[PDB]
Design a protein around this nucleic acid. Structure first.
Ligand SMILES: [Mg+2]
Ligand SMILES: [Mg+2]
Ligand SMILES: [Mg+2]
Ligand SMILES: [Mg+2]
Ligand SMILES: [Mg+2]
Ligand SMILES: [Mg+2]
Ligand SMILES: [Mg+2]
Ligand SMILES: [Mg+2]
Ligand SMILES: [Mg+2]
Ligand SMILES: [Mg+2]
Ligand SMILES: [Mg+2]
Ligand SMILES: [Mg+2]
Ligand SMILES: [Mg+2]
Ligand SMILES: [Mg+2]
Ligand SMILES: [Mg+2]
Ligand SMILES: [Mg+2]
Ligand SMILES: [Mg+2]
Ligand SMILES: [Mg+2]
Ligand SMILES: [Mg+2]
Ligand SMILES: [Mg+2]
Ligand SMILES: [Mg+2]
Ligand SMILES: [Mg+2]
Ligand SMILES: [Mg+2]
Ligand SMILES: [Mg+2]
Ligand SMILES: [Mg+2]
Ligand SMILES: [Mg+2]
Ligand SMILES: [Zn+2]
Lengths: 138, 133, 169, 81
RNA sequence: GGCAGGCACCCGAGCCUGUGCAACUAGAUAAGGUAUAAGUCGUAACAAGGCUGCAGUAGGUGAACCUGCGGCAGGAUCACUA
RNA sequence: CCGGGGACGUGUCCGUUGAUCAAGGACGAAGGCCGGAGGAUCAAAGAUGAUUAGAUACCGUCGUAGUUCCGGCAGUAAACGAUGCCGACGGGGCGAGGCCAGGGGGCUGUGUCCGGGAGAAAUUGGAGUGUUUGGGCUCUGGGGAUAGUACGGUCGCAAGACAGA
RNA sequence: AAACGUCCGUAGUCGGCCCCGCGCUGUGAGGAAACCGCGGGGCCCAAGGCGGCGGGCAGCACGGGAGCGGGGGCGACAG
RNA sequence: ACCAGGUUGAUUCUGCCUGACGUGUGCGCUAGUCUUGGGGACUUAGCCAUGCAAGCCAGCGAAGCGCGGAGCGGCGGACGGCUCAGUAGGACGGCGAUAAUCCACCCGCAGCAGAGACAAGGAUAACCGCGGCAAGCUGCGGCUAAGACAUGGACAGGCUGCGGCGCGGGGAGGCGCGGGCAGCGGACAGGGAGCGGCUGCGGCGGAGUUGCUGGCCCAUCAGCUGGUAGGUAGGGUAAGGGCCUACCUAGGCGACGACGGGUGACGGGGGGUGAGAGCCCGGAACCGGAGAGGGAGCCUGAGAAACAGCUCCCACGUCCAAGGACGGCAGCAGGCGCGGAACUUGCCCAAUCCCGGCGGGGGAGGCAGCCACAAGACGUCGCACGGCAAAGGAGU
RNA sequence: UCUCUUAAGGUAGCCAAACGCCUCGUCAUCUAAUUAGUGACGCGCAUGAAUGGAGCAACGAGAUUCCCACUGUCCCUACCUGC
RNA sequence: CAAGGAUUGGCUCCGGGCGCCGGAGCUGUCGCUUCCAAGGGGAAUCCGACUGUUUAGUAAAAACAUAGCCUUGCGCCGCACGC
RNA sequence: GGGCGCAGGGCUGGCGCCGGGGGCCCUCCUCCCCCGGCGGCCCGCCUGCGGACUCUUGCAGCACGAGGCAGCCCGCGC
RNA sequence: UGGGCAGGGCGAAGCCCGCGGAAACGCAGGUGGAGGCCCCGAGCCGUUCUGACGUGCAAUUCGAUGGCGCGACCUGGGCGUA
């Protein structure tokens, strides 16, 4: 396919090659639409269902304070990890919290397994405001 | 035979048969001048004019008596790959009876943009060159 | 109403086209004014651009010429003898273009015998046309388009054009 | 206008008798009904008349052969000697 | 009943029925995969891994797997009427 | 017996007829399947005698399918040189091929050894002539696992195969 | 991680030597401003404003010494 | 025109992950000044209270007390604005075609019927009364205008058929014009503020069709096509055409990817990012298209298949005295809902321009306000002045 | 894993089946409601491999359930005709 | 004949390849296989493969038969593809 | 032997036209009822000449002799 | 040894032609007329009505409905088997 009149064959062939590229594979499939949690739109906001006990991947031995959250726009039940030490007591049941990704392109961050999203705001006020006491939860 | 009495245009200015010169530096075939056919769609002895693009293509199909399929093969350049592509489009071209027997499959035929003669016919055969020549 | 677009048609390759926009008045067609014989009734239409198009609904006579001698009269239309596109249009006596019709022979035979008085050779040149004239049969074609012009003008059939058509009806 | 894609001559049996039985009898019904070349006149005109008797309909050359073929493997071997 | 109404044609929403295509979802049950704190049973592979291994195919076994046949060395042999 | 094959040799002929391939077609070990024939050995399954903590295995004995042939299916292998085909060029040595020549010769196969170059290295006459990157053509790969799995399709009597997330 | 078990094979793509048309290419036309590139330009500076100059198009016209066709001649460590 | 960390006991690789940089969307924390720009595109082309957004006039000129301004008549409302659902070619872009077509304003030309002609006929609204009706809306009577609607009157243009030579133009002709015979048909009975009507030719301004060509993904979409491809003829149209119909041919497209599907696809001018080849984006200023809750049909008009026009259906919503009456903010603010995600129910025609024959109107548009959303520059409180439609800010 | 015992201990399959006593089994589906039907489940009183097992394409005046349509089957009868 | 849909009379014509076929128009109180004749259909389960057979007179079946598959005996037979 | 079909077909019917015989009719209607061996050719086989074509609704046929021409045979048929 | 048994429907091989193909062959249209094929007539039978009848028409019939209907059939005669 390297002849001077092979351009339509090369476009036909290299596109079929490009379908095996994993970065192009997600845009071709539309996986950001198949999960409407964080792909197409950032900052998913949903209702907390229960506090989750999840243990870190070994060799690290700790317990991350995750929460199940049902989204408002979807109804999808996704688990989300609470940062900022002691914040799990500042969030309660039937709160409406906003969730963000980890900066890992949809995978788990560090020792946590399975948890692909993390909370930033609870009842439309941030956890950085509550970890230091800057604002107040209504 | 024919649904209407076969009739041609009144020749303004063989003075008993109507035939016009289509212009653009072309010639009327002598089969059109000395002929008895009454095709109204013919560029020379009929009610169409030649205006617009005149391209040269090769006859692909001579089926379906008055129309022919003319393929114009061209190259399109893909700027990314820096190679060409062989492309083509087929045209339903009106073949006047003045070219009957003269034009056969394979001949290089120059076609001129007419009116919209049929649904898919916008070109008419104005001249031709044999493949063997 | 009826349209003129090909937005409902298939493509050259046979592919079906998607129909999305609402119909435009740019490409609107109308009913066939199936013009018949009767006392003259023409319909006026403010068509595109305000210009008044007159289509004939009923139509009694037509301005018919004799091309050999250059004289004309408006003889009355009697019936359609032949229509090329469909014989349904001659059964209903529908006046369109190129319809062979039977004309009134009286007004035409008066000038035809008058020129036959001076030139005796005229009758022998086409015997078939003058055969039907003494029987009273005179035929012509409409050359105007009565749905567009509103008239039924044409010429008298003579010569080989006549024997072409009398074989067709 | 083939009519059948796979069964051919055993399409007369319809859906009956089982696929393997129709598949088994297909090779024999092709064999017992076919015209064969006469080895006395040369023409492809040998037809079975009854089980075991094969006759050329052109030159009337009739010969005793197999049940559904003019020749069997045991019958060919005895004649090739 | 000439501002009504009627008739035929034409455009035709909308509804109903049947169906094609596209995409989604409930489901007793049941099979995988992955992750679990690693528990029980072994030890198939890695050494000739203790029966050389592997893949194919076929059958069988709680389970890794075992066996038959033909390959292969990625073998434990580059090596013997020279 | 019938058929085939390449190499060599040649003032024989043709004169570009070619290279490579989606589709398509044919062949395709073993095991398997179908119908028929046959059945000595060996031997899945099965049965035993042992071994063992256990032993459904390894060992001993027996034994069916099978192994065999004929007609067909199937269409898979570590089907390997784990190395696509065609083409140009490129160091010596040793060999046991075939044809030719007779002047440690030429063609064409085939191994081997040492170098060159390449390579992450093992190695390697191509895996060389590649950042000094371009001979043509086809195919494939794009971190691991999920998984050569599922769905849909095609093929198959079935086993399953192809393809393939 | 990855040469399909083999061979045939059509489209496709590629293809020996000698001896007017088309590809390719140069200039030019025509092509909106915004934009962009450049150039000025003491808006106090700057981003700017404002004014110059350019580009865009395998469409069109003209030109082009080479390349390809057509047709003969070789007969390729091509077949 | 760059790499760095990460598989190992250590090594060399392959390999991916991650860091490092730009961009835009959102969040978070924080915040002194000024200029400039942007801001419900993404989900919901979801639902909308209230107000406003397209009106104007010079013909005729009533009431009302010559002034006057109603209604008739006319022009516009088909432009702007908003939005991006549909659309994979009905688009768009480039190059054409319209010898296949239509036309308002405006501009330049030619012209506009002797008819009793120092002259034009019947009306209707306004209005004067009488009413119906919850409201929306509407009736009866009486009079009365015209640049409204007629009458009068045909030299031409025009239409159609037939005839037909030339002269001009054009690449190409009965295209223009002159010369013919018929059948039709057809341009001023206006005024004491500038004129205004109408017919034709040529523009301009538009518009409809249209040719070639280029532009996403999927082959786990391989064959597709029946008005389909063509012919003849008619119809229909402003106009070529299977556009439609009648009859007749068997065609048409496809691995140079048809057909079918997908798209959280308007296209483009362009934007982002890279040394470049490329990759990605284009809702968003300008241009083109399309739409106005889903539809379909239409009236008027030069121009709409119009929606701040109509008619109906559907889905939502409202008022009723229960007979009926209405609503379409993808115009401007504003509300709700949606979501991650987006401002004041501010002032004004002053600027930019548009409609109207001028005084008018314009949520187009500007000004200000809100917002660290962005670009740029610069630090760590009250007069007078100044500008502004007005106010505020800049500047003394 | 151990142990008793048999000629061998029911394999592949299949099932409250025309084969399940308990039993109207349990779960699902079907219905307003189902001892029925179907799909599952299987320590199956007492399923099971030519005493043939599994299997339903085609076929059936076979046995059964549901749906559509249909109806004097019924609500709930009435009238007419012949005999 | 899966399911499911449309059409169907009379008259007057036209066309064709003319025992017939196609088309058009007109027409009736919408009606046309006008009487007669003449399938109800779908989703499933059980059993038997099928066509066939049977208890003349209570059972037509799932029973029987069947082909296929298999086993047995027989070289004194109708001669092993046989009985 | 059986069977679909092709061709023929004892005969039967219809229509048209003609011909007897009988009966019925407000109008209409030509109503109603009954009756009407022999020679040549054709098949097809075979023969002669000759030498390669030739069907059938259908498979096909044909140098072991096609079509054609001229005969012959025996039936169906006219 | 004789005889009997409408009319339709579906359309198997084979064949002809067209189209496609490098080839193998594949589609399409006719042709052909297979099959214990389909609906059914005469006829045969006996599913249901658990109809009629049930001291009957009848010591098994009648009617409707249904099944079969070129067969693994039915049937006259002759013959065999007690
Ligand atoms: Mg081992
Ligand atoms: Mg083998
Ligand atoms: Mg084997
Ligand atoms: Mg065998
Ligand atoms: Mg042994
Ligand atoms: Mg599958
Ligand atoms: Mg590998
Ligand atoms: Mg009034
Ligand atoms: Mg009045
Ligand atoms: Mg969209
Ligand atoms: Mg845009
Ligand atoms: Mg079991
Ligand atoms: Mg139950
Ligand atoms: Mg029930
Ligand atoms: Mg057994
Ligand atoms: Mg049993
Ligand atoms: Mg039966
Ligand atoms: Mg039906
Ligand atoms: Mg069914
Ligand atoms: Mg049965
Ligand atoms: Mg009984
Ligand atoms: Mg069996
Ligand atoms: Mg002969
Ligand atoms: Mg039968
Ligand atoms: Mg029956
Ligand atoms: Mg019986
Ligand atoms: Zn023979």
């Amino acid at each position: 396919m390297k002849g001077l009149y092979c351009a339509k064959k090369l476009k036909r062939n290299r596109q079929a090659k490009r379908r095996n590229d994993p970065t192009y594979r997600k845009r071709l499939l539309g996986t950001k639409y198949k999960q409407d949690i964080i792909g197409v739109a950032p900052q998913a906001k949903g209702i907390v269902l229960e506090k989750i006990e999840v243990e870190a991947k070994q060799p690290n031995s700790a317990i991350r304070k995750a929460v199940r959250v049902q989204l408002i726009k979807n109804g999808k039940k996704v688990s989300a990890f609470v940062p900022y030490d002691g914040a799990i007591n500042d969030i309660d049941m039937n709160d409406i919290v906003t969730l963000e990704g980890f900066g890992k392109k949809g995978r788990s961050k560090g020792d946590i397994p399975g948890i692909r999203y993390k909370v930033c705001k609870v009842q439309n006020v941030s956890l950085l405001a509550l970890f230091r006491g800057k604002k107040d939860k209504p | 035979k024919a649904k209407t009495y076969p009739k041609q245009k009144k020749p303004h200015l063989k003075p008993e048969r109507y035939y016009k010169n289509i212009g653009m530096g072309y010639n009327v075939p002598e089969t059109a001048i000395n002929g008895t056919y009454i095709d109204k769609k013919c560029p020379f002895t009929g009610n169409v004019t030649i205006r617009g693009r005149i391209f040269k293509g090769e006859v692909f199909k001579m089926k379906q008596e008055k129309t022919i399929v003319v393929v114009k093969r061209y190259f399109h350049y893909n700027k990314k790959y820096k190679r060409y592509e062989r492309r083509n489009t087929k045209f339903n071209v009106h073949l006047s009876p003045c070219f009957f027997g003269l034009v056969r499959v394979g001949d290089t035929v120059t076609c001129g943009e007419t009116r919209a003669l049929s649904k898919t016919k916008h070109f008419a055969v104005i001249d031709y060159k044999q493949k063997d020549s | 109403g009826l349209s003129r677009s090909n937005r409902h048609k298939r493509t050259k390759t046979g592919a079906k086209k998607p129909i999305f926009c609402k119909k435009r008045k740019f490409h609107m067609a109308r009913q066939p004014s199936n013009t018949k014989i009767g006392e003259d009734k023409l319909q006026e239409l403010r068509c595109r651009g305000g210009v008044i198009k007159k289509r004939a609904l009923r139509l009694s006579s037509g301005n018919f010429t004799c091309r050999t001698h250059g004289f004309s009269y408006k003889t009355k239309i009697m019936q359609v003898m032949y229509h090329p596109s469909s014989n349904e249009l001659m059964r209903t006596n529908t006046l369109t273009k190129s319809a062979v019709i039977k004309l009134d022979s009286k007004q035409f035979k008066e000038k035809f015998d008058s020129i036959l008085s001076t030139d005796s050779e005229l009758k022998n040149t086409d015997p078939l046309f003058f055969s039907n004239l003494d029987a009273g049969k005179l035929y012509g074609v409409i050359v105007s388009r009565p749905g567009q012009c509103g008239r039924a003008d044409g010429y008298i059939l003579q010569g080989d054009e006549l024997n072409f058509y009398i074989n067709k009806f | 206008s083939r009519g059948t894609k796979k069964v051919g001559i055993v399409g007369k049996y319809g859906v009956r008798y089982g696929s393997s039985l129709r598949k088994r009898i297909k090779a024999i019904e092709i064999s017992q009904h076919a015209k064969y070349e006469c080895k006395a006149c040369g023409k492809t005109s040998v037809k079975r008349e009854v089980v075991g008797i094969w006759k050329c309909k052109a030159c009337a050359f009739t010969f005793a052969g197999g049940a559904f073929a003019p020749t069997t493997s045991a019958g060919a071997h005895s004649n090739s000697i």
